[PDB]
Design a binder for this molecule. Structure first.
Ligand SMILES: NC(=O)c1ccc[n+]([C@@H]2O[C@H](COP(=O)([O-])OP(=O)(O)OC[C@H]3O[C@@H](n4cnc5c(N)ncnc54)[C@H](O)[C@@H]3O)[C@@H](O)[C@H]2O)c1
Ligand SMILES: NC(=O)c1ccc[n+]([C@@H]2O[C@H](COP(=O)([O-])OP(=O)(O)OC[C@H]3O[C@@H](n4cnc5c(N)ncnc54)[C@H](O)[C@@H]3O)[C@@H](O)[C@H]2O)c1
Ligand SMILES: NC(=O)c1ccc[n+]([C@@H]2O[C@H](COP(=O)([O-])OP(=O)(O)OC[C@H]3O[C@@H](n4cnc5c(N)ncnc54)[C@H](O)[C@@H]3O)[C@@H](O)[C@H]2O)c1
Ligand SMILES: NC(=O)c1ccc[n+]([C@@H]2O[C@H](COP(=O)([O-])OP(=O)(O)OC[C@H]3O[C@@H](n4cnc5c(N)ncnc54)[C@H](O)[C@@H]3O)[C@@H](O)[C@H]2O)c1
Ligand SMILES: Nc1ncnc2c1ncn2[C@@H]1O[C@H](CO)[C@@H](O)[C@H]1O
Ligand SMILES: Nc1ncnc2c1ncn2[C@@H]1O[C@H](CO)[C@@H](O)[C@H]1O
Ligand SMILES: Nc1ncnc2c1ncn2[C@@H]1O[C@H](CO)[C@@H](O)[C@H]1O
Ligand SMILES: Nc1ncnc2c1ncn2[C@@H]1O[C@H](CO)[C@@H](O)[C@H]1O
Lengths: 435, 434, 430, 218
């Protein structure tokens, strides 16, 4: 079993869309030109677990152009774009992904990426979005000194890396790609500002203008989500546990309250926290009729979906990933993607341009970890650690995306560079800079 | 013992000081929390920071905490004379007036370095821009007499890192600008309100419909662009950092070079903390009655000397608003002689956001002073720059939520373990950018 | 394995019982580190004179958990009962007294295969640099070596030449330049083992003779001292004015080989350099002049020329060749120019070799334990930390009954070190 | 048993003294043992030793614990830079009689009735009771001093030897160290061998030096 996708006949359609996506990903395409001839990932055997979308297809073929062997699976049961998976599969890249996996199928798909490489069959690098692959490899398979690095995409996965580290259970160097400035401050923020509403609208065609929306969390994701809804004329309320994030939201003109303060009136609920049990059994029974409930954090357990399913009197699939529940009170709740990431589960995830930032960081992480396997710069012992990309490379990634937009950079004079204490070519900011 | 423009302005200052205190919940809460235990007893603070109504609340907070204090402004045009008068009337030594000469500015500063109790020297510095710090460390001897400095602004903190790296930092420095509750609030939201306030009090120009060039897209330029854009200006941004550049572009601003818009822009605002942004290359190309202003810490972002030397006419329209006639016949309106326009032409940032900044200053001074005999903040060659702990940054934010009616959700123990923090915080890892 | 005679295992086991009692330091590392096994995982390729002293080193490494494969780093330095004992114990050894140049080469290549896994070594332990040269220039081990520890001045000289040339890929710990090696082994070791080699070889009287010692480094200092201790009049040659002033200040004439070549009864070369005793010297020497080398390689003496141009050569006994020159006079060459202490005797005594080999154990531990700490990137040359230098010395005081004064806190503060040291600054020369 | 102790021990032994040595450093102590000296604690020999020589550069080496145990007419002296290696203040305060035998020789009578001879009141005995080091060895020392002054003074507006915060301690370059030795070989008739180009290459140095790497201990 070398690939498993919904329908291989979708491959041509995928390949048409891949042309458009490549044009929208100038940074990834430029890394292909800059690094392809020198093949920095020759010998790398990368098992990837990341939403199998058109964007991830451009990433995958970039890794392969740089020399890597790659086997791939999605990190969510509803995020695969079947035509993208098909396009990769038809090219001969092993991909085990389809939209609408069972949890059992999900695990089978992941397992498929950890065997079947050349010469011994074992991966030697992981590329992970959410930590599921990392955990399975480190806890359940064996690969115990065979892995030279992991690059982690998302906030929840990065939190899990730091928990693993602190528990003394990180045995491979980890590159924290989420917290590249060109990742967290663009993907998490601007990607969600576009993709949340796309998810909601494709699922429900609900009017946002005039509605009351409750956005749980005001990190980078909730900042973008709040911005998106407000832009269409929703009245957005925000919940938070961090007083700094809470004060930001208030200074931007959002009411900051508890879920319970708005639960009876809000038309739309969006969870963005990366935490569990945000929308619970205490809330669902108080919601107004046809309240839309969705999640954009990494895991569905932000919402008590199992509770809803067990306690609803009726459930109607309106269309795939749109379920309308009738509660005992007679009113309805619309749950999107069974509480899975709504932008990917109900729409297409973030657009290609912002994913080019994220994936340039992933490519640069993989190069950094692989090309340094034998230098001890990123140890695999019990001393294994989490690392960030150097600021110089973060700046490179941003600069790769300015041209498409027509944005022109001023050049510091030597006198100016001296005065602000940086090189003429950067980095331009101290390491603690928050942008 | 003090020197201010007019002591009869004291009563007016004290009226407005009531309003300001009420807008500064966090500072007033620090007064209540720390006042009885007098954590700054024995502290002798020389302050160099814009002598505004907001700074008056800071100063009296430091005094309520047990500090002796002597104060000067860190800009020749930023003093609010009724604020200075209210402080001076209470017997706090202040040497500050709006419209100082550079010579007077230096005399004011020097007055803060003498005249304390018993021996008469300061033992702590509180600076905004680094001018006091440089003067003390390079030009005085107060050598070994100073236990700390807390620094307010990006330009001053940059200079601290330069000194540190030159091996010329000999006192512990608290980087207050780079507290999250400072840089992401004062620099951003304070400028978002006070930039346009400055421009409007100076000129009454309509913002709507104009083309504005915002030079720099840091915390200050983000706020400034946001402000102009909210009133209907078409904002263009310049930057040297590709990350900042991409943020501006993703927010819907054109990112270009000064040269690309110099002929058409109605308003230029420099926000860089760098020099020679608006130059001799530019002024001769500007449209008639282009407004030129700076909100960065020092006026040398704009070549004002060149402007003055090369203009054919200069008319003071009203104080801090000068209209220059160039050889080409057209006019440039320069605000505050290129000094910080929010403070020079208006009142600076509003009290509420300054309460964040100045809570950080008070907690920084407490931290340095109470720890003087502990070795935690070494003086001498091993002197470093420090940030306030995240727990304190979060405390500052929390102090300001109630005024606004913002309510915080409380994590359950389960949730707290899951996100790898304590129920009471800190809630974010040290590298978090907010 | 490959040794001369495995039935000499019994005799070697008996001497190793005496060697063990003379090496308190190595036996004390065996007790301290054996329980925790800090070289577990370690796959040591070894290239160091296969003596009784190295046998106690090899068994320490294996007690510490390491797998080990060994070859001697000189053709005539092996002690055949030493190799026979290690070979019986199950340790793979390829070493006999009197290897040809072909055979010497084969033995080294044996140590780079036959580990577990596709078991290529992950560590090197070197004396002279030859193994380091072979692995780096000619083997494939490119991704596989975490370090090399280098025992001698000549081998270390190469490591610095490589680092300089941008060709050092594996981290190197300079063991020779530990104080407890260079100022002990090189010095006191040679002070006893040089005359041992000469006398076992020739039975010649030292007292009354004129001896030319060429070079006055740590080895030259020791040899001159030894010869002088027996009533030789020693003259010294040097290219370094500092070393020359030291020899002059100790009572020795410093001159050129040519100034004494016609009258010297004994020539010793200690330089680590080539062509010290050459075709221009040999025909000038007095009858039965004894010529030998105690430097790493034999090419301090032009032995090929000697062999090419002698009228007669006679083997008095193994490693003692008596040449008759064109002039009718004779030259007695020892060990064919090979290290004379190891070639004609047993090398340095155990007690001093315990200082050196402790350094080698703590160097291997340091390199290998930090093999996933990123402290020695796979590339620089390093020193053992002075703390461990002092430890080595401290381990050897007890056997001699030496007692160490303990610093008070006042005293340690006053001389600017911890009560338990390091006691000297990093540049101290002892 | 540093450089001073090494010399002092070699001198005493050279005249037929049995020399015992004290040390706090295991390396220096082992050097002393391997040169044939007993290494023991001052307490181990305080009652039997005829001569006590202080060479540590450390204070409180010979103390109130030692003085009252010393044999009759035990000679006590110091050659390290400061006299406080010996508790002379104590000796003076607790002795029952002091006689100047001659300048820089004080004979003290202890409460036990036995005598202590102290040299130069504990000051550097070589300079205090004699003329210090001979000229020839001081020529080495003082050549480095002249070279040092030239290095620092001539390069004063250079930044090679930074002022203030970043001031640091330096050694003379090894080339100059060699120069000084070379200047003293002639008087002694010491002849130096000249490396050939191949020899210098093989050893990895210049023909004219420096000949050793900077870590070399000679
Ligand atoms: N769907 C996507 O395309 C996508 C993209 C980026 C990130 N993510 C995921 O989205 C989530 C959010 O990421 P982020 O970068 O914004 O994280 P973040 O840490 O910046 O922000 C989350 C916020 O939630 C707050 N919070 C935690 N528990 C809360 C609770 N009980 N109630 C209210 N607020 C609470 C925190 O204080 C924080 O400010 C993560 O799970 C991340 O992996 C998803
Ligand atoms: N007026 C006020 O009330 C007030 C308030 C806060 C800060 N400040 C001051 O304002 C200034 C800016 O502070 P900040 O926090 O935004 O700093 P910042 O470092 O965050 O941003 C300044 C930006 O200018 C950019 N830049 C530098 N040189 C440039 C040039 N030649 N052309 C275009 N862009 C350039 C940098 O890349 C950077 O992003 C500083 O001088 C600071 O001390 C003033
Ligand atoms: N046989 C043994 O058991 C044993 C033990 C230790 C070291 N060694 C070896 O002995 C040799 C010397 O070691 P070391 O520690 O004394 O080295 P070292 O560098 O301290 O001493 C060598 C000396 O020879 C001098 N020299 C170089 N070329 C010369 C020339 N052509 N004429 C006169 N003098 C010259 C140098 O100035 C130097 O002082 C090295 O090859 C080392 O590997 C052998
Ligand atoms: N008198 C002279 O003409 C002259 C000449 C040279 C040096 N000196 C002085 O001699 C002193 C020593 O110089 P050096 O070059 O030998 O120093 P050094 O560091 O080489 O030797 C001092 C030794 O004393 C040891 N030591 C420290 N405390 C000890 C203790 N309480 N008991 C026993 N040993 C102890 C140290 O471990 C060290 O090895 C210094 O004060 C120096 O200034 C004087
Ligand atoms: N389109 C996408 N592809 C891959 N990962 C994503 C995407 N959006 C958010 N995360
Ligand atoms: N109002 C203000 N008071 C003091 N400092 C300031 C102010 N605004 C900006 N920086
Ligand atoms: N006995 C020995 N063993 C190993 N190496 C040595 C020896 N002597 C000198 N070098
Ligand atoms: N003779 C001397 N002159 C100067 N200094 C010395 C002397 N001896 C030791 N130190």
């Amino acid at each position: 079993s070398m690939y498993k996708v919904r329908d291989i006949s979708l491959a041509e359609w995928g390949r048409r869309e891949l042309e458009l996506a490549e044009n929208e990903m100038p940074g990834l395409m430029e890394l292909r030109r800059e690094y392809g001839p020198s093949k920095p990932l020759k010998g790398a055997k990368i098992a990837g677990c990341l939403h199998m979308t058109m964007q991830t297809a451009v990433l995958i073929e970039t890794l392969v152009e740089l020399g890597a062997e790659v086997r791939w699976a999605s990190c969510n049961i509803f995020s695969t774009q079947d035509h993208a998976a098909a396009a990769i599969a038809k090219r001969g890249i092993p991909v085990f992904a389809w939209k609408g996996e069972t949890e059992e199928e999900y695990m089978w798909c992941m397992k498929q990426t950890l065997k079947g490489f050349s010469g011994d069959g074992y991966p030697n690098m992981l590329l992970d979005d959410g930590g599921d692959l990392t955990n399975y490899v480190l806890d359940e398979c064996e690969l115990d000194g065979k892995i030279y690095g992991v690059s982690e995409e998302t906030t929840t996965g990065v939190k899990n890396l730091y928990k693993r580290l602190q528990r003394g259970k990180l045995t491979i160097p980890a590159m924290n790609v989420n917290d590249s400035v060109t990742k967290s401050k663009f993907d998490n923020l601007y990607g969600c500002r576009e993709s949340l509403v796309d998810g909601i609208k494709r699922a429900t065609d609900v009017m946002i203008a005039g509605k009351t929306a409750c956005v749980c969390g005001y990190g980078d994701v909730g900042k973008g989500c709040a911005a998106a809804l407000r832009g269409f004329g929703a009245r957005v309320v925000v919940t938070e546990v961090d007083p700094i994030n809470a004060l930001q939201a208030a200074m931007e003109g959002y009411q900051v309250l508890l879920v319970e303060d708005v639960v009876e009136e809000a038309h739309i609920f969006v969870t963005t926290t990366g935490n569990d049990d945000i929308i619970t059994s205490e809330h669902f029974p108080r919601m107004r009729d046809d309240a839309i409930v969705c999640n954009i954090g990494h895991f569905d357990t932000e919402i008590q979906v199992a509770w809803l399913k067990a306690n609803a009197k009726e459930r109607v699939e309106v269309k795939p990933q749109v379920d309308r529940y009738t509660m005992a009170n007679g009113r309805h709740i619309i749950l999107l993607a069974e509480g899975r990431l709504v932008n990917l589960g109900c729409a297409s995830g973030h657009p290609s341009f912002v994913m080019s930032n994220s994936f340039c960081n992933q490519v640069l992480a993989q190069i950094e970890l692989w090309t340094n396997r034998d230098t001890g710069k990123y140890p695999r012992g019990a001393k294994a650690q989490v690392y960030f990309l150097p600021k110089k490379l973060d700046e490179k990634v941003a600069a790769l995306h300015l041209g498409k937009l027509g944005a022109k950079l001023t050049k510091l004079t030597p006198k100016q560079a001296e005065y602000i204490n940086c090189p003429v070519d950067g980095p331009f900011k101290p390491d603690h800079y928050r942008y």
